Design a protein around this nucleic acid. Structure first.
Ligand SMILES: C[S@@+](CC[C@H](N)C(=O)[O-])C[C@H]1O[C@@H](n2cnc3c(N)ncnc32)[C@H](O)[C@@H]1O
Ligand SMILES: [Mg+2]
Ligand SMILES: [Mg+2]
Ligand SMILES: [Mg+2]
Ligand SMILES: [Mg+2]
Ligand SMILES: [Mg+2]
Ligand SMILES: [Mg+2]
Ligand SMILES: [Mg+2]
Ligand SMILES: [Mg+2]
Ligand SMILES: [Mg+2]
Ligand SMILES: [Mg+2]
Ligand SMILES: [Mg+2]
Ligand SMILES: [Mg+2]
Ligand SMILES: [Mg+2]
Ligand SMILES: [Mg+2]
Ligand SMILES: [Mg+2]
Ligand SMILES: [Mg+2]
Ligand SMILES: [Mg+2]
Ligand SMILES: [Mg+2]
Ligand SMILES: [Mg+2]
Ligand SMILES: [Mg+2]
Ligand SMILES: [Mg+2]
Ligand SMILES: [Mg+2]
Ligand SMILES: [Mg+2]
Ligand SMILES: [Mg+2]
Ligand SMILES: [Mg+2]
Ligand SMILES: [Mg+2]
Ligand SMILES: [Mg+2]
Ligand SMILES: [Mg+2]
Ligand SMILES: [Mg+2]
Ligand SMILES: [Mg+2]
Ligand SMILES: [Mg+2]
Ligand SMILES: [Mg+2]
Ligand SMILES: [Mg+2]
Ligand SMILES: [Mg+2]
Ligand SMILES: [Mg+2]
Ligand SMILES: [Mg+2]
Ligand SMILES: [Mg+2]
Ligand SMILES: [Mg+2]
Ligand SMILES: [Mg+2]
Ligand SMILES: [Mg+2]
Ligand SMILES: [Mg+2]
Ligand SMILES: [Mg+2]
Ligand SMILES: [Mg+2]
Lengths: 95, 85, 17, 344, 237
RNA sequence: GCUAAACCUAGCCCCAAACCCACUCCACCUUACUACCACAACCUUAGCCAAACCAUUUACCCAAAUAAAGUAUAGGCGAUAGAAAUUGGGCGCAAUAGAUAUAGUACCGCAAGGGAAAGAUGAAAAAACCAAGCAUAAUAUAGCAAGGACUAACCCCUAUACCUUCUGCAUAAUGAAUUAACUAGAAAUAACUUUGCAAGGAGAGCCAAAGCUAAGACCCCCGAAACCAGACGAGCUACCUAAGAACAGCUAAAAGAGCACACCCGUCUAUGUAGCAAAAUAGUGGGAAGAUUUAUAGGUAGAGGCGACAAACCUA
RNA sequence: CCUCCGCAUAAGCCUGCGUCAGAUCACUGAACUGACAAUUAACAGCCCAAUAUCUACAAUCAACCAACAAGUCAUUAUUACCCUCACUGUCAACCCAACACAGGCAUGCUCAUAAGGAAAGGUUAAAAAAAGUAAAAGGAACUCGGCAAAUCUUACCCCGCCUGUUUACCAAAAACAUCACCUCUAGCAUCACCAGUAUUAGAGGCACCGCCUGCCCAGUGAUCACUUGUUCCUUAAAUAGGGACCUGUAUGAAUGGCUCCACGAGGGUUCAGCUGUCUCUUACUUUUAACCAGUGAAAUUGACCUGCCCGUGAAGAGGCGGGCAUAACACAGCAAGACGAGAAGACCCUAUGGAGCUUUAAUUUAUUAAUGCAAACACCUGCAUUAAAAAUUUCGGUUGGGGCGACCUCGGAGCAGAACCCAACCUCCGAGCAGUACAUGCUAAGACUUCACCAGUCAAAGCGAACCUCAAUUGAUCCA
């Protein structure tokens, strides 16, 4: 990715990242399952449900995603009626 | 002078293109100059003359930029000098 | 398959006291 | 390894290689007959519709009669009298010079396809068995089917043995017998389907079958000329052909070891090649008469020939058994069939 | 490049004029014709191919006397120097034109066919049908273009209602008017074809240069295969 | 004790400020620097490179710093690209450094073009020691050159040079004659560490559920064959053009004839191989009035020319 | 004693062995430095008032003769026209090759000089090396081969007709060209071809000449009638009938084979001689050499106080182990070792490195030409199509010594002994589904996992209803 822009000399975000992942303010990232729209006739219903769910990403994936994205995307946003509002903060977390 | 994509798909080869206007040699009469001219023109010019209702009007109304002709400007200079004098 | 020779500039050899 | 070679062999297509082999061999064998066989082979294969007895056979018979197709076995049986042929079999064919294709098979009222489209030549070896009610039939090479379906249509067989080495082919065999033959007739070991080496059968089961049909792997003459992929004549698979003739003897022998004393074995080949027509049967019969010491006699089918003379053409220069040759008037698959019973 | 043509003379003369060889080069300076190089230096003699050209302030059918018939470097055909009135000019000589012969040049179209003598020049309409002719023009007063090589002859095939069909030496027809003029007979130096260049030197003298060393497979492209029948081409043994 | 060593100042670099020189007499676009006679300029940059290949694609100055914002948006929706409204003198070099510069000179190249090196007394010249290499002063059994020692230099005993790439490697393989000088780790997110202030931090913009502000501390050097644009080259060689010049003697029915000088070429041998020579010499050979050889001037130019095609030649 | 050199002009160079004073292989001097001189035009360069107009016939002792490739050299009419010798080159031992270089270098006169030059610094007479001269008897026995020296032969064969051309610097040929013969294309003007025109011009093939080798023209009757073919008129449309036409031309091969003269620094064989090529080498001279005197390089070089044998290092030790040997120091030879020195590395492999060439590889048609449709009233412009000619880019991976391929994903079988994983490579067997439901609905605790991620797998409870088999059976993102 571009560490120093040629116009302004600041970092740039990889837009491939932004249209695939949701980052929560706490530091987690959310993705969809790969192939959730693919060939559903042959898949079993349990398999289908496992596909529909929005999952988290492990530490390294999360680290890589944060490097590929600017500080703007990491700020706290007070959207009106976002369905992900509750998930922004953690609860009862000791290490 | 520009470039094009081969079959109006950006994934195809890029090529150099030049679009040239169609030209016609035509005869005009200037009322102020009382002179017959034969000049190379386009359909656009003929259309503008029609809308302005004569060569003199076309020459006199049109600014320098739109005329795009040294000879157009020289015609203009003469006519304006004739009106002045 | 041929290497041309190279001469050093003449000024060094023409040095005097 | 050496990358550069002085002269590389020409890249012949496999179908052309088949024709090359056929041209250099069958020319000497057939002489003036070869051109007519050649022209027929390169031409379309005419088909027959074998009616499923388990379907509404009467309506299908009426339907195929309306479409100007005659049942050949019925008319053959009419003039048969002027051992018995296999009854309860009905396959309709078009008359000579009528090249029209039969409409594809569709499922009937009972949920089974009303007829099966296959070469009426391949129907002859089943007729060659003198099948009687309460007989036990061994079919050493079953898949993909056709002959097996005909054996089932006869309804004279108490138990069926179906065997093929490749599970790929037995799969389609399973499919066709499931789709054509109802579950009621399958029941329990009335149809046994197995995927083992046919050669082992000789020492696995002996004196167990009164009727055997042996459809040995052949050069697949018509199939080789038309089909490109998985061609037996592909030059890479040359090695197979060297071990092709012996295999045939082995498989035949397994049948002759498994048959009852006085039991009937019919041997069929889809090829015209003499080395795998007569050389095989004489090789098999000598093996078992010498090593194992079993007397086997071979019947002449000249009486069988004269009946289907109107429907089929027969090569006259065959020593024993019968071969059918393709001609454009009545185009049917090249096939050899011979009937034999072991005396003791 | 700095190239000037040598053909800058504007006034007709009889005197031999110095030529410059091209070598197959253009004004651009690059070769455009292969196999041309310096042979023997040659002087050009101007030829008046407008056979009916009456003298200054003179009109009507005229007459000339043959003086000489001389080898020409710059063509195959032999040339004749003719004088008449007070004029000398070079022309193309026919089969049988010796010195002292008298030649006629006319523009008269007779109702009846004129004398089918050789060396004389009449309008095509004047000439009879089937007569051997040379130095023909396409349009009147243009000048001879067509049959002006050694031993070459065309024939008048048909004349109908103001059109003449002549067949060139290529056995090919051409339409022309009768108002156009043609001289009668076959051109000089027959058996120019029967000339044997002895050795390579002879050709080099004539200003030719040798054919290139490089091997050509063919000048013509192979007939392009069709999509239905590719396998039929290059069917391997 | 030689060869040497040592030097401080010519000047230069980055800024700021400010809009620059176009010059006695003579000559100078013809073969420039030569007193003196009848054609004409404006015309999309490409490519390397990135995409770990490559084929669409890949930042390049456009007229206010900051912020909006790496946002909207664009894109083999991938590499990557990317708005707008709106807001508003010296912690420099000091002769291998610093300019290439004592100078675009000498020198090198047909031309375009390439391109150096070096100096040092004192107010006045009208006045001591240290690199390598050597010398003073060659050498005495035995062996990575030393170490342990010893009264004692050697003798005694112990001891398989260095770097780099390989699992070992003693040694194998690259690299080093030696001395002096010069010659190679540049930066973000996020964390940690230490401060200030604290539900707020920051000298607009931004962040904040103890955070925010500031600082500290992390990302090398030399090397291809190539590709593209614009100039320069046919004084060598290939071919052509113009106007020339050369070819003794002898035999020949007289000739791209024969023998054979000068000339042109280069078959075979030997010498030479940092040479006399970046292709020569001695002898022996091929042609030697011809498709011959040769002097002068001109022409054809690299996406090309030229070619009795050898992938030949177009300044070793 | 030597001279294939000289003297001159041109071309190139630019004061570069004249004088005088200091100064430094060779003079303490000169081809060094400084100062001073010089090359004189008659030779040569440097030219010409205008407009028309003229200029057919070679050169070669040009005579006789003889050609072919067809050739360097001329004016006249009228007008205008009276001043004079200016300007420049002129030297030398000299130029292009980095050099005072065995090389390159045009013409005239001298063809051996009337001009121009000097192979030996001194000595000695080793080896090895170079170039000569002679050699008993033998005469190719040498050798890949008569290479070389000699001597100054003969008959053939293969290939190419010949003279010619070619890889400047490893190939001179059997390759190329070539007379002749054959194929293709072109019916025509003012920059090539060409001031040409089908007996011509261009693009090619083969290689002279001399011979043998030439047909899909429709069959039978006999220039005549039928039978065919091709068209039409029928025919619903065919068994197919009825009319029309094929006698205004006519062959054919850039086809193949066989002789033959002459020629060749071509390749092979051979007779006769000949010679130190050899049996088997020798002697002398010159060069070199080695010494004395002067001048004075280059590759190379970790440091070296630098031995032999055996072992070790698998091969490979001066240096490691065990023995043995051993005062120090020049000069001359030799080439066994120092994996001796020097190079644009010969071969094999690799690089998601280049480049040249070809094409039926992929992408195209920017260019050129033709055709069509618009526009305009023959060209031009836009759009489209068909060809030519181009351009840009690529050439995955594993395994294969006498081949003419097998593989690449998933599941088994031989190897796997008892939690997990693991018998490579290879040799084999299968899979790219099928059948049955149609609650193969929704939702959700906790777990398993093919050693990562992606994927994959099991499932309690709950909401609503009812009283699956199968070893594998499969495919991310973008995009549509
Ligand atoms: C020629 S086909 C039988 C003809 C066909 N089923 C019919 O009835 O018309 C024989 C089949 O046997 C199979 N096969 C091969 N080896 C076999 C063996 N050892 N035992 C049995 N069948 C074998 C082959 O795959 C081949 O397709
Ligand atoms: Mg030719
Ligand atoms: Mg050729
Ligand atoms: Mg790339
Ligand atoms: Mg890279
Ligand atoms: Mg400096
Ligand atoms: Mg400098
Ligand atoms: Mg020292
Ligand atoms: Mg010791
Ligand atoms: Mg490495
Ligand atoms: Mg080594
Ligand atoms: Mg030249
Ligand atoms: Mg040449
Ligand atoms: Mg001669
Ligand atoms: Mg000669
Ligand atoms: Mg070649
Ligand atoms: Mg080659
Ligand atoms: Mg004079
Ligand atoms: Mg003298
Ligand atoms: Mg001397
Ligand atoms: Mg000496
Ligand atoms: Mg000796
Ligand atoms: Mg002797
Ligand atoms: Mg011998
Ligand atoms: Mg011998
Ligand atoms: Mg010899
Ligand atoms: Mg020859
Ligand atoms: Mg060479
Ligand atoms: Mg040459
Ligand atoms: Mg040579
Ligand atoms: Mg040839
Ligand atoms: Mg020759
Ligand atoms: Mg020596
Ligand atoms: Mg000495
Ligand atoms: Mg050296
Ligand atoms: Mg050893
Ligand atoms: Mg050593
Ligand atoms: Mg020594
Ligand atoms: Mg290499
Ligand atoms: Mg590449
Ligand atoms: Mg590989
Ligand atoms: Mg297993
Ligand atoms: Mg796992
Ligand atoms: Mg529940």
């Amino acid at each position: 990715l571009t560490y120093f822009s040629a116009r302004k000399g600041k970092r740039k975000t990889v837009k491939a990242v932004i249209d695939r992942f949701l980052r929560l303010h706490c530091g987690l990232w959310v993705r969809r399952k790969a192939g959730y729209k693919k060939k559903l006739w042959k898949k079993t219903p349990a398999r289908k449900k496992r596909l529909r769910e929005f999952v988290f990403c492990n530490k390294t994936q999360s680290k890589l995603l944060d490097k590929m994205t600017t500080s703007f995307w990491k700020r706290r946003n007070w959207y009106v009626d976002d369905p992900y509002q509750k998930y922004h903060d953690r609860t009862n977390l000791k290490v | 002078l520009g470039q094009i994509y081969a079959n109006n798909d950006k994934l195809s080869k890029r090529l150099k293109k030049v679009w040239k206007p169609q030209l016609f040699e035509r005869e005009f009469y200037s009322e102020i100059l009382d002179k017959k001219f034969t000049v190379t023109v386009t359909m656009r010019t003929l259309d503008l003359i029609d809308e302005a209702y004569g060569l003199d009007f076309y020459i006199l109304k049109t600014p320098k930029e739109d005329l795009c002709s040294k000879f157009g400007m020289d015609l203009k200079r003469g006519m304006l000098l004739r009106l002045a004098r | 398959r041929f290497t041309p020779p190279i001469y050093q500039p003449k000024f060094k050899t023409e040095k005097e006291f | 390894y050496k990358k550069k070679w002085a002269a590389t062999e020409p890249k012949f297509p496999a179908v052309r290689l088949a024709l090359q082999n056929f041209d250099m061999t069958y020319s000497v064998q057939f002489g003036d007959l070869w051109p007519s066989i050649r022209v027929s082979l390169l031409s379309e294969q005419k088909y027959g519709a074998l009616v499923n007895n388990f379907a509404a056979w009467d309506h299908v018979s009426a339907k195929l009669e309306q479409l100007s197709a005659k049942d050949f076995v019925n008319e053959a049986i009419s003039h048969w009298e002027l051992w018995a042929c296999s009854p309860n079999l009905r396959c309709f064919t078009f008359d000579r010079g009528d090249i029209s294709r039969f409409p594809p098979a569709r499922p009937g009222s009972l949920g089974v396809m009303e007829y099966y489209l296959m070469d009426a030549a391949s129907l002859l070896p089943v007729l060659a068995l003198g099948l009687q009610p309460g007989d036990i039939v061994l079919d050493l090479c079953a898949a993909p089917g056709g002959k097996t379906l005909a054996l089932l249509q006869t309804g004279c067989c108490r138990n069926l043995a179906a065997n093929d080495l490749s599970p790929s082919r037995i799969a389609r065999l399973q499919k066709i017998l499931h789709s054509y033959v109802p579950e009621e007739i399958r029941d329990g070991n009335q149809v046994r389907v197995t995927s083992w080496d046919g050669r082992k059968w000789g020492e696995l089961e002996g004196d167990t079958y009164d009727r055997v049909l042996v459809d040995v792997p052949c050069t697949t003459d018509r199939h080789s000329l038309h089909e490109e992929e998985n061609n037996i004549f592909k030059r890479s698979r040359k090695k197979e052909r060297q071990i092709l003739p012996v295999l045939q003897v082995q498989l035949l022998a397994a049948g002759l070891l498994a048959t009852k004393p006085g039991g009937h074995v019919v041997y069929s080949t889809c090829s015209l090649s003499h080395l795998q027509n007569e050389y095989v049967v004489q090789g098999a019969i000598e093996l078992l008469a010498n090593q194992y010491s079993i007397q086997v006699q071979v019947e002449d089918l000249t009486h069988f020939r004269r009946v289907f003379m109107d429907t089929f053409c027969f090569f006259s220069s065959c020593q024993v058994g019968e071969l059918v040759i393709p001609n454009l008037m009545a185009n049917f698959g090249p096939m050899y069939f011979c009937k034999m019973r072991r005396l003791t | 490049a700095n190239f000037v043509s040598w053909k800058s003379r504007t006034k007709y003369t009889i005197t031999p004029v110095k030529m410059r060889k091209s070598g197959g080069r253009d004004h651009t300076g690059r070769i455009r014709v292969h196999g041309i190089g310096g042979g023997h230096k040659q002087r050009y003699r101007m030829i008046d191919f407008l056979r009916f050209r009456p003298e200054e302030t003179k009109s009507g059918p005229f007459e000339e006397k043959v003086i000489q018939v001389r080898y020409d470097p710059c063509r195959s055909a032999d040339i004749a120097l003719v004088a008449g009135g007070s004029r000398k000019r070079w022309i193309i000589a026919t089969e049988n034109m010796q010195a002292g012969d008298t030649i006629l040049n006319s523009n008269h179209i007779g109702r009846m066919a004129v004398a089918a003598r050789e060396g004389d020049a009449h309008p095509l309409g004047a000439l009879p049908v089937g007569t051997l002719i040379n130095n023909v023009e396409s349009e009147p007063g243009r000048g001879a273009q067509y049959i002006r090589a050694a031993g070459t002859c065309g024939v008048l095939l048909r004349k109908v209602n103001g059109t003449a069909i002549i067949q060139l030496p290529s056995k090919r027809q051409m339409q022309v008017l009768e108002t156009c003029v043609a001289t009668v007979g076959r051109v000089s130096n027959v058996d120019h074809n029967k000339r044997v260049i002895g050795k390579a030197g002879r050709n080099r003298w004539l200003g030719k240069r040798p054919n290139s060393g490089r091997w050509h497979r063919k000048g013509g492209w192979a007939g392009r295969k069709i999509r239905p029948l590719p396998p039929m081409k290059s069917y391997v043994k």
